[PDB]
């Protein structure tokens, strides 16, 4: 991964090749995750230059190449650049980077996004502050200006991206986060709010001139044990799509709960269990409706730091007659992963 390091500039070229397969009943239309080949590759660079004793400049870019497309018309399906940003870091004074980067509410949702293939269902991409989104400026500071140890905060700005689809668009916004970490334990909360595009407002599902997202998290991460839990709520932010009426939009509200427990055996296997529920509320023509509801059992075997393999079984507890159309069948994944 680190393939260049000279004159204070060092460059990490990293990637992985993941052979993935999904097993679900029938064609997989009614699945948690779908069915068939899911193989993909990943490439990126993390660069970092030591300008002087205080200044470290950095930049990073990361792409997703799908292995499950044909070489014909569909070749580009699912291909996307994931991250692309540059920034500056000041000697225990903080850091600042602009570009396409993780939204701030992920600073809390990351606590539970530890599953072998799935989980982290609320960290939608291109969805205000819960996932990777374009055009964010981020101030972060670790150990509170050198004073308070283990106390991080971060504040972020969201520039409007008026795109072609309501789903991926967003208006101006701002958000922030604070965490404390002390001896294996961690607590974090984060909140963001932003204006909605006229496109998003003219949607059948969802109403409000402002979208809002918050989440809070606890973790214990020590002695081969990992336990984490997340609660958060959204108003006008989780993108939902009603399969019956073929409409898109957003949930006016959701309450979101996620939990994760994992052990790391010294012989290489890391089993994992998790529960995830996303309840939507005040939905146009439906009311209260579940979006995510499953238990998960999974494991990963680590051959070494570069080669691994995993299985991830989602016991989908969504109802069979879900008023929004969420798939109610289970999905189980098998993956083999070489990374560098």
């Amino acid at each position: 991964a680190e393939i260049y390091n000279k004159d204070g500039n060092k460059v990490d070229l990293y990637g992985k090749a993941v052979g993935l397969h999904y097993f679900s009943k029938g064609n997989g239309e009614n699945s948690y995750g779908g069915n068939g080949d899911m193989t993909y590759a990943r490439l990126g660079f993390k660069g970092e230059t030591q300008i002087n004793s205080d200044l470290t400049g950095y930049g990073q870019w990361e792409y997703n190449f799908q292995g499950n497309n044909s070489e014909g018309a569909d070749a580009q399906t699912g291909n996307k650049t994931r991250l692309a940003f540059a920034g500056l870091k000041y000697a225990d004074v903080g850091s600042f980077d602009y570009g396409r980067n993780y939204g701030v509410v992920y600073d809390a949702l990351g606590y539970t996004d530890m599953l072998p293939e799935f989980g982290g269902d609320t960290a939608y991409s291109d969805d205000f502050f819960v996932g990777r989104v374009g055009g964010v400026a981020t101030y972060r500071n670790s150990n509170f200006f050198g004073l308070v140890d283990g106390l991080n905060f971060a504040v972020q700005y969201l520039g409007k991206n008026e795109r072609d689809t309501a789903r991926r668009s967003n208006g101006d916004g701002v958000g922030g986060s604070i965490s404390y970490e002390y001896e294996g334990f961690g607590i974090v909360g984060a909140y963001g709010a932003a204006d909605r595009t006229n496109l998003q407002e003219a949607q059948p599902l969802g109403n409000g001139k402002k979208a809002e997202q918050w989440a809070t998290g606890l973790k214990y991460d020590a002695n081969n044990i990992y336990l984490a839990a997340n609660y958060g709520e959204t108003r006008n932010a989780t993108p939902i799509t009603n399969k019956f009426t073929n409409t898109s939009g957003f949930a006016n509200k959701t309450q979101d709960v996620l939990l994760v427990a994992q052990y790391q055996f010294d012989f290489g296997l890391r089993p994992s269990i998790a529960y995830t529920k996303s309840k939507a509320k005040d939905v146009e023509g439906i009311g209260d409706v579940d979006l995510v509801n499953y238990f998960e059992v999974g494991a990963t075997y680590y051959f070494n730091k570069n080669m691994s393999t995993y299985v991830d079984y989602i016991i989908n507890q969504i109802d069979s007659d879900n008023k929004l159309g969420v798939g109610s069948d289970d999905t189980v994944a098998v993956g083999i992963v070489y990374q560098f």
């Binding site: 055996f265 012989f267 290489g268 089993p271 075997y301 393999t309």
Partner: protein, 199 residues
Amino acid sequence: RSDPLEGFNRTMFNFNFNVVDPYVLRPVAVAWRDYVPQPARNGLSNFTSNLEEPAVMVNYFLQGDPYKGMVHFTRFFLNTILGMGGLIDVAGMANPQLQRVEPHRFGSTLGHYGVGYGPYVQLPFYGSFTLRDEGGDMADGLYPVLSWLTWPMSIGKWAVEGIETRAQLLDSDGLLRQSSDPYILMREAYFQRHDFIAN
């Protein structure tokens, strides 16, 4: 040691020792050692020993050893997907804490929580047999992987594993013929081995 039906067993053991072995099993084992090539042999005994790996995991949990129990999950998982359905011991080549070991099925769970053998019996064509362990291990046949074996496959799995065992023994196959009472050795060996597993 206690041995109630010792009278019946010895005659039924002699049937096994003096006729059903040298006329049937030992020539078959010679043919096996002579014609089946080694990659083929290690592929099957890994493959048959895989169908017990999920059961050996289940029974280790029932004894309160999630560690050992989670090892055998790893065996099954790695060897089934990567090891071509269990033919290749990817798990054994992987870690030493994952090396193939003797199965711990329902018999060991019973004896772990205090159960006994009652009487040692020896059956013709079958060999040594207890109620707790043999036949008590049949419980694992009632649930996944082993519930998927038809009784042709089951007697096939038993048979193939047995012929392999007999082929490995073809060298000691004769040091036992040089001992005063070979019934008591291959009775104490049964309890020596079955106690070690159960403890």
